[PDB]
Amino acid sequence: TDGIYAAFDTLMSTAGVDSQIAALAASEADAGTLDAALTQSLQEAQGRWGLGLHHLRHEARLTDDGDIEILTDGRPSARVSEGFGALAQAYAPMQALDERGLSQWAALGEGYRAPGDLPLAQLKVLIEHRRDFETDWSAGRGETFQRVWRKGDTLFVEVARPASAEAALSDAAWDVIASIKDRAFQRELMRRSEKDGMLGALLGARHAGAKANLAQLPEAHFTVQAFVQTLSGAAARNAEEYRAALKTAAAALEEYQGVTTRQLSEVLRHGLRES
Amino acid sequence: TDGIYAAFDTLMSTAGVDSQIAALAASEADAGTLDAALTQSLQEAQGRWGLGLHHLRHEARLTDDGDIEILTDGRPSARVSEGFGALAQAYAPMQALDERGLSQWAALGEGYRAPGDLPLAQLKVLIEHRRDFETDWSAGRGETFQRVWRKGDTLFVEVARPASAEAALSDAAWDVIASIKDRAFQRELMRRSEKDGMLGALLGARHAGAKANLAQLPEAHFTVQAFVQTLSGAAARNAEEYRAALKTAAAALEEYQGVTTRQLSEVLRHGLRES
């Protein structure tokens, strides 16, 4: 229960979010301020994780016993103390991914959902008109996927590059593995993988070296998959602003997948005896 | 029971003995020729494997049934078709290795044998005049050890740096695994290692892209631990030559460790795809 703010910060980090809940709390921020930050973080994380739940309202808040409560549409879904896997299980029945790992739910709920591979001439007509609208997924520049919707005064541009948690973890672990120099430690990891796989060898070495059960990785369940760029006012009705926003969104995505993966690699060294 | 020749040659490989027990029967030389070539190669390998059995006659000869027999001092030891491992199990009881992995057998035995800290001046006396002599091990540059003995018209200089075969396999396996950039292949190896371990996953993606194999890695049992340099005739009574033989030995230990580790590494990338 003393790890709950830090566990949360750490869950937000998998999405490139710097929530700073443990810090906020230790500075004696009031509860309203902590709850507003829990919620803004969770919402930002939801735009990156690619679970496909733009149609739900996401909230989080402190409880008296020191826990953090995660809500969807004002209903409790999980508490941070139940663990990161549990939070993933609570979201799973709300999700509907296709085989590309893209959410099949709409973002709007009420409105028109256009084909994602429309002519720009036609998408321009949708963007310049007042009504809310929404576009379905399609491929996009740089081996991405993209869609867009508008809710009132804001245009939401989503770019995704799906990846499973497990695959993104394997990559960070590989990078750690590939850089070990101590020959004795190398030989230890070879043996361990006999029974445990390469992952598993690395994870067992962190626990053994730290002489404790280290905090489970929220990266086993969550990872950066997408970025949502936002536009407002006149710009949210301008087709060239939209096109510029797609490149922005794609560039930010690449950046988040880059540092979050490097940050997982550095955390994975925690506890390693190396030498 | 056919290609027992290819194994031998492959086994000689691990000691950088580039025998040709395949191309010598390909050109159809006689039972005596081959035997000469078989036993020569074996002796040469014993120079480098570092099993510390200088005090035995080592021999290999064709058997009636088209096999290859390894004998030690007249008593058969094992047969090639019986497999790399079984050779090492036969040598095991013949050995006696100290706390550093240096042999505890004298090379001559019935030759008094001088301390490894002999002053050169004194060693020089032994060399130039007169008879058989042996030195116990003593440290040398580069974490090596060294000793020297003469028997009859031939003087032997051994530079040795012990290391487990399995240690040297691990080391080479690691360098390969650390050289892989492809993420798909990396995720492949990881997943593959969940049942098969890091070795195996590597070997396994080898029967895939190599179609076949490189014989139960003889490197799994034998590696370069040493190099013997030899002098004969006048030079074997010259101290200035001895000194140069020591340097040669020392440099060759390095050279043969490199040319064999490369090989093992290329074997280890024998069936994988980096493209």
Q: Which two tokens stand for residue B108?
A: 């001559």
Q: SS3 letters for B17-35?
A: CCCCCCHHHHCCCCHHHHH
Q: Give the C-alpha separation, A63 to B141, whole Å.
A: 66
Contacts of A261 (CB under 8 A, 6+ apart): A168, A171, A172, A175
Q: Give the C-alpha separation, B182 to A205, whole Å.
A: 25
- Provide the 8-state DSSP code for B224: -
* Cis preceding-peptide flag for A243 (omega within 30 of 0): no
Q: Give the C-alpha separation, B34 to B9, whole Å.
A: 12
In one-letter notation, the amino acid at residue A202 is L
* Cβ–Cβ below 8 Å for A186 and B174: yes
Residue B116 Cα, gap to closest chain A Cα (Å): 29
CA angle A54, A57, A59 (to 5 degrees): 125
For an interface test with B, which of A174, A175, A203 has the most B Cβ atoms less than 10 Å from its Cβ? Answer: A174
Look at the block and give the residue holding tokens 């090639």: B80
Contacts of A231 (CB under 8 A, 6+ apart): A154, A155, A157, A241, A242, A245
Q: Give the C-alpha separation, B27 to B39, whole Å.
A: 19
Contacts of B247 (CB under 8 A, 6+ apart): none
- Provide the 8-state DSSP code for A42: H
Q: Which two tokens stand for residue A206?
A: 């962190």
Option in B171, B183, B193 nearest A198 (CB): B193
Q: Give the C-alpha separation, A110 to A50, whole Å.
A: 21
CA distances from A149 to A5, A100, A230, A236, B134 (A): 33, 20, 10, 10, 87
Domains of chain A by residue range: 4-94, 97-275
Which of A148, A172, A122, A142 lies closest to A253 in space, CA to CA? A142
What residue spans of chain B are helical by DSSP H? 4-13, 23-26, 31-49, 84-91, 120-128, 165-177, 183-196, 198-207, 239-268
Q: Give the C-alpha separation, A63 to A80, whole Å.
A: 11
Three-state DSSP state, A261: helix
**The dihedral formed by the CA atoms of B98, B99, B102 and B105, expressed in degrees to the nearest 10:** -10
For an interface test with B, which of A171, A186, A261 has the most B Cβ atoms less than 10 Å from its Cβ? Answer: A186
In one-letter notation, the amino acid at residue A262 is R
Option in B170, B183, B190 nearest A197 (CB): B190
Three-state DSSP state, B114: strand
**Do B138 and B147 meet the contact criterion of CB atoms below 8 Å apart?**
yes
- Provide the 8-state DSSP code for A270: T
Q: CA torsion sign, A103 to A107 to A112 to A114?
A: negative
Three-state DSSP state, A15: coil
DSSP A145-198: EEEEEEETTEEEEEEE----HHHHHHHHHHHHHHT---HHHHHHHHHHHHHH-H
- Provide the 8-state DSSP code for A235: G
Measured in whole angstroms, the distance separating CA B249 from the mean position of its chain's CA atoms is: 14
Q: How many CA atoms lie within 13 A of B254 on its CB side?
A: 9
CA distances from B258 to A104, A206, B218, B264 (A): 56, 33, 17, 10
Q: Give the C-alpha separation, A112 to B190, whole Å.
A: 44
**Do A200 and A193 meet the contact criterion of CB atoms below 8 Å apart?**
yes
Residue A266 Cα, gap to closest chain B Cα (Å): 17
Give bridge partners of residue A154 from the DSSP assignment. A151, A232
**Do B193 and A198 meet the contact criterion of CB atoms below 8 Å apart?**
yes
- Provide the 8-state DSSP code for B216: S
* Cβ–Cβ below 8 Å for B193 and A190: no
Q: Give the C-alpha separation, B212 to B197, whole Å.
A: 20
Look at the block and give the residue holding tokens 């390894």: B70
User: How was this entry determined?
Assistant: X-ray
Reported as type and span, the H/E element at residue A95 is none
Maximum CA extent, chain B:
66
**Do B70 and B42 meet the contact criterion of CB atoms below 8 Å apart?**
yes
Q: What is the distance between the terminal CA atoms of chain A, rounded to a whole angstrom?
A: 33
Q: Residue A253: what are its φ and ψ, rounded to 5°?
A: -45, -55
Contact list, A170 vs chain B (CB under 8 Å): 186-187, 190-191
Residue B18 Cα, gap to closest chain A Cα (Å): 29
In one-letter notation, the amino acid at residue A22 is A
**Do B159 and B145 meet the contact criterion of CB atoms below 8 Å apart?**
yes
What residue spans of chain A are helical by DSSP H? 4-13, 21-26, 31-49, 84-91, 120-128, 165-178, 183-196, 198-210, 239-269
- Provide the 8-state DSSP code for B105: S
